Amino acid sequence: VKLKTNFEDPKWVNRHKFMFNFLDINGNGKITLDEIVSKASDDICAKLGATPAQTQRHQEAVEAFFKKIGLDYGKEVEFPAFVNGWKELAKHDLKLWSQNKKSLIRNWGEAVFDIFDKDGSGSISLDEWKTYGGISGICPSDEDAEKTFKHCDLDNSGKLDVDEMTRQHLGFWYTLDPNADGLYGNFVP
Ligand SMILES: [Ca+2]
Numbered sequence: 001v002k003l004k005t006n007f008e009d010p011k012w013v014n015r016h017k018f019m020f021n022f023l024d025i026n027g028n029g030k031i032t033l034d035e036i037v038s039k040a041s042d043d044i045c046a047k048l049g050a051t052p053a054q055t056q057r058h059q060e061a062v063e064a065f066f067k068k069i070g071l072d073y074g075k076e077v078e079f080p081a082f083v084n085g086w087k088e089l090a091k092h093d094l095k096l097w098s099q100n101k102k103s104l105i106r107n108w109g110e111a112v113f114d115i116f117d118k119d120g121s122g123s124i125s126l127d128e129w130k131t132y133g134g135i136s137g138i139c140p141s142d143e144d145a146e147k148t149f150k151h152c153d154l155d156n157s158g159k160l161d162v163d164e165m166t167r168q169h170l171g172f173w174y175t176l177d178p179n180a181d182g183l184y185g186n187f188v189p
Helices: 010-023 033-048 052-068 080-100 104-116 128-134 142-151 162-175
Strands: none
Touching: 010 033, 010 080, 033 052, 033 104, 033 128, 033 142, 052 104, 080 162, 104 128, 104 162, 128 142
């Protein structure tokens, strides 16, 4: 995993703008934590049939993750401030990860995978990633989900584990590590 960021690369700014536009479903150029948490709980966790405890751990993780970016309940955040907030989060999490500490991005990954994980493996299958991908919308075709798995280093079960997805996410969301390109197939640039 690379530890240096590339905040000035328009490709990194545009990757987040793409995701901002994806979250800005009502098209008003603003995002609220309310909207984000609703997507996490009322939409994704509900459709996944998550348990009360899983739903709550997942909501806490999504909340902490996006609060670090500067989102809050009842606060509208526009794109320039949103991407400046990713700088806070990126430095925060890269520091933690490099010191073998739990990062907010790892915590989110644990919460998502836990919904699917029935054996304590902290790993998910291709079909489970297809499910999460289609319900959240971030991997909206089976081919893209397949690309994620082809892209990553899978474990002895052909499954994606949380440590591997965390490393990939550091590079994809935080540092623009070229090794992380294609993480979400052809969807997220
Ligand atoms: Ca909006």
